[PDB]
Design a protein around this nucleic acid. Sequence first.
RNA 1: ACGAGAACAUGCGCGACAUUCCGAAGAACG
RNA 2: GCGUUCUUCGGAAUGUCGCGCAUUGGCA
Lengths: 210, 208, 129, 124, 306
Amino acid sequence: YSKIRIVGKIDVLTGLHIGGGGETSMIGAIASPVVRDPYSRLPIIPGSSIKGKMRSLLAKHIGLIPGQKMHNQDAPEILRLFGSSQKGAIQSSRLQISDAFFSKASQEEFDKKDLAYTETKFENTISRLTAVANPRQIERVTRGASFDFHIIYNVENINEVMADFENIKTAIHLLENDYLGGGGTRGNGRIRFVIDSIDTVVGDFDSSNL
Amino acid sequence: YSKIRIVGKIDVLTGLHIGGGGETSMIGAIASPVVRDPYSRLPIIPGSSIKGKMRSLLAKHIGLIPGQKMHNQDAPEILRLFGSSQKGAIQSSRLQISDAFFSKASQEEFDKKDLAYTETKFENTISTAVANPRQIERVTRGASFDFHIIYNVENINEVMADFENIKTAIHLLENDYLGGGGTRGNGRIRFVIDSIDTVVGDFDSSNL
Amino acid sequence: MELAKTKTGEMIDLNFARKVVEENKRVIVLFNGLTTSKLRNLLELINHVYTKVYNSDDTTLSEDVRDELEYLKVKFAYESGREPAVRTFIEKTYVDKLVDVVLKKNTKKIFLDYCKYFEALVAYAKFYR
Amino acid sequence: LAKTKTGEMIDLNFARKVVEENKRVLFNGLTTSKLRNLLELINHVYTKVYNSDDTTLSEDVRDELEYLKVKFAYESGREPAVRTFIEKTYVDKLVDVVLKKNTKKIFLDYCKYFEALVAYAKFY
Amino acid sequence: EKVYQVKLKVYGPVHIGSGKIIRKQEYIYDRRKSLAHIVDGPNLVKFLNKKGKFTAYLQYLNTTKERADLYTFLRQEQIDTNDWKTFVLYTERVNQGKKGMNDLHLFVRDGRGDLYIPGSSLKGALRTVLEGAFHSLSISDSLPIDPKNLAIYQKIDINKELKPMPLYRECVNVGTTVEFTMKINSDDWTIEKIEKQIQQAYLQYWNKWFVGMVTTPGGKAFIKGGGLPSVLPTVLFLGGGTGFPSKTTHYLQKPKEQAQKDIFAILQRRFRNVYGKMATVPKNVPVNDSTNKWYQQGVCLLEFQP
RNA sequence: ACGAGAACAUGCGCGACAUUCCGAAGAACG
RNA sequence: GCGUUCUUCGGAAUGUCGCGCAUUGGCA
C-alpha cells in the first residue's frame, strides 16, 4: 500500500466566498459569511469544496454521459479518482482532499499592513421592474491570501497512477481557469495552485515523476 | 468542454465610481469612497458590477418581458450566458466575468505623473437653495483596469451567438455607463480587448 | 444586557431597548423624527468595530478597537449636533454612555453585548414603524 | 498623541474639554466657517496620507504639514478667534509633534483630534 | 436611447469650484503684470526653508496680519522670478474690478489635473430648468478644458450700485466651447421639448427678474458697458455666483409678485443679517475684464446636435 | 471459559444557483 | 471678505433547495 502526499498552497486571485453555516448575523453585518475554522476563526477552503469543484470540472471536460443524474454515473476515470458509491461497485476515492487552512505565511502578511483576512463586499440587486437596489454584504477572502492545501492519493493500481495524476493535473488546471467558491460567475473564486510538493509519504512507490 | 479566456483592459473615460458602502471618514472628507482591493489598497472594478451592468443592458436591448420581476426571466440567450436560477430550469453561466484589478501599467503611469488613482470630486445638492456638500471618490480619468472573462463552451453551436451577445453587451457598456452616477457623467468607460484565447479545450478562438 | 443603568435607574438590556423604542414611538416618527437612514449610518459606524472585534478572539478590547470606540463617540456627538433627531435618539437610548461603559470595562463580551443592544434598537425601530 | 500642560494628554475627550471650556459663543467668537476652513486645510494632507501605504510620512506630506502650520499662523493672524482656538487646542504644536514622529499613526491621531474638535464645536 | 452632442458656449465667466478657498498668502499676484501664479504650499515652504527666509516669512505674517500677499514678501526678499517658477504650479490672467486680490476660488479639476465641467452640474442646471424623467437624461462629463481658457475673474454685486466683492474666482473665459454627450429615452424626454423648456425658462427669468435689475442704475451701467449680449434662446446658468433667481423654480412656477414674496421670505429665514432686518418687499429679490466689456456670471448658451 | 465472537455509520457530494452599492442630488446661496 | 449646508431619503439580503440514495427497514 502506497500513499502519496500533495502538500502545497492555493493562492487566491479575486477573492473566494465559500459560504459559511449561515449563522445568526448582526443587522448590517455580513449577510453571507464565509466558512471559517471555528478554532482560529480564520477562513478556510473545505476539502469537500475543492474535491467537488475539481470533480465536476473533470467530469465536464471528459464529458457527461447523456441524461446523467447521479455522481456514480461519471466516467470510469473520475469514479476511480474521486470514488463511487454505486451498489455493488463501490470504488474507494483515491483522492482525499483536506480543508485548505489559512496559511501562516499569508496570515503574517495580513497581520502586517493591518489587513483583515476577510473583507466585507457590498453588492446590490437592481430590480427588473422597480429598478430598486437591495443591499447585500458578502464576506470574501482577501485577494492576497493563501491556503495550505493537502491532498492524499492512494496507489491502488500502480499502472493507473500516471493516468490518475494526469487527470489530477487536468482538474487542477481547470480549477485554476475556473473558480472555487460562490459567485465565481460574478468574479469571486479565482485561484491558482502555485506550490506543489508531491512526495510518497507511505510505501515504496516513487513519486518523483508525478 | 472548452474554457475561452478574454483578457484585455478597461479604461475609464469620465471617471468611474463603484461605491464601497462608506467607511471611517474624517468630517467633510471621503463621503462615499470607491470600492478598493483590500490587499493592495487600489481601486478595483468588481466583476459583479461589470457582469450585472452588462446583463441589464443586454436585457434592455433584447427587450424585457412585460411585468418582469426576477432576473431569471430574461431572454433565453441572456439566461444561457449570464446564468439562471429558475426552478427546474437552471442554466449554467458561461460568462465568468472576474474582478477588473488596477493594471500595473496604468498604476505605474499614475505614480510617474504624481497623480492619485482616485479623484475626490466635491459636489453638493441644491435645495431654499441650500446645498448638501459631499466628496465622492471616483476613479481618475485615464485609469485602465485589466478585465478577464471566462466563457465556457456548454454548446459548441451556440458559441457564435453567445459571443455576438457578448460583443453587443460590451458595445452597450461602452455606450452606457458603469458603476453609479451615470446620469451625471461619471461612470463612462471603454473596452480594449487584448486577445481571445481558448485556454482549455479544442475550440478555436481565432475567429472569435 | 447587563451593560449599565440609566439615570432613572432602569436596567439596560434588549428589553430596555424595546421599551425605549416603544416610548419614543410617536404616530410613525420615532425618537422625535429619526429617519431610518440616520439609524443605519450609526449602525454601520457600530458595525465596523463590531466586525473588528468579531473576527478577533481576545477577551480584552484591542487598542485600535478602543480608539475606534472613542472615534465612535465623536461620530455620535457629530450626528447629534448635525441632526436633532439623532441627538434625541442617543440621549433616550443612552448609547454614548454605554460606549464609555464598554471602554471602561475593556471586554470583548461587554462590547458584543453593547453591539447586540444597538442591533436590538435598530430592529425594534424597524419593527415599530 | 502629545502631552498638554499639567500632564494632560491630547485626546478626543480633551477636545470636548477644550470646546466646553471655551464655550460661553466659542473660543472668544469662533464661528463654524473658520474651523471648517481649518478642517479643509487638514483634509488634503489627510487624504494624501490615507492613500499612501507607507507608514512613514512621505516628504511631500511633511512639507504639506509645514505649510499647514504656516496657514494656521496666517489664519490666527487674520482672526483673533482662530488664534484663541489654536492656542487653546495646541493644534499648531501638534503638527510639529506629528512631523517629529514621522508616523502615519500619529498623523491620523492628530486628524482624529481635529475631527473631534469640529464635532464637539458643532455639538455644543 | 437617443444620443446628442451638447455644445456650451461661454458668454459669461463660469466657475465650478473644488471645495477649496485659497488666499493671497497662498499665491503671488503681480498687478503690473496682471498675472496670478498659483503656488503650491509645500514646495514654497521648502524653498523658503532652504533659502533661510522661512523665519522672515513668519515675521512678515506677524507684521501685517490681515494682508500677507506673498508677492510683496518675495519682492521684499528680492527672490528671483525663476526661483518663483520652481514652486508655481501654473499662472492665470486676472481681471479685477478695483490694488490686489482678496480670496481666490479654484476651478474644479479631475485627478489628472485637467479643467473640466462636471456632468453633474450641467445635469442639475437642466433638471432645474425642467423641474415642475431625470433618469433617462444622462449628461456626460465634459471634455478637458484648456488651461488657457481658465482665468481669474472678479465678483461684483449689483445692488443699485456696482460694488466689487473681495472674492475672485477662476472661470472659463467668454467665447469658450465645452462639449458634453447627452443621452435620453424617447418616452421620458424629447430634445425639442427640453429645448423649448429651456427657452421658456430663460424668457421667464428675463421677464420676472432681469428687467428689475436693468431698472437699477447699476444695472443700467451694466447694460451700457456691454454686460448683456444682443443674442441673449437657450441660456443656462451654471457657474458659481449666477444668483438666487437662477437655479431655483420660484421665478418659474410662481407669479412675479408671489415669487418675489416667497424668495424674500426664504432669504429672511435663511439670512436674517441682511434681509431679516428689512421689513419691506424689495423691488427686485435679491463681472469685469481688462477691457471695457462687462459680463454676467455663469451665463451660457446651449446647442444640441444629433 | 462474559448473549458471546468478529463488524469503520460507512460509500458518493462543488453552501451552491440568480443578483450593478445602486436610484435621485448643479460647490452654491446670501 | 464673512456666514450656512460637509452628505441626504430609501433599500440592509431575497427566492430555490434545506439532506438524497445503499445497506438496517417494508413487501415477497
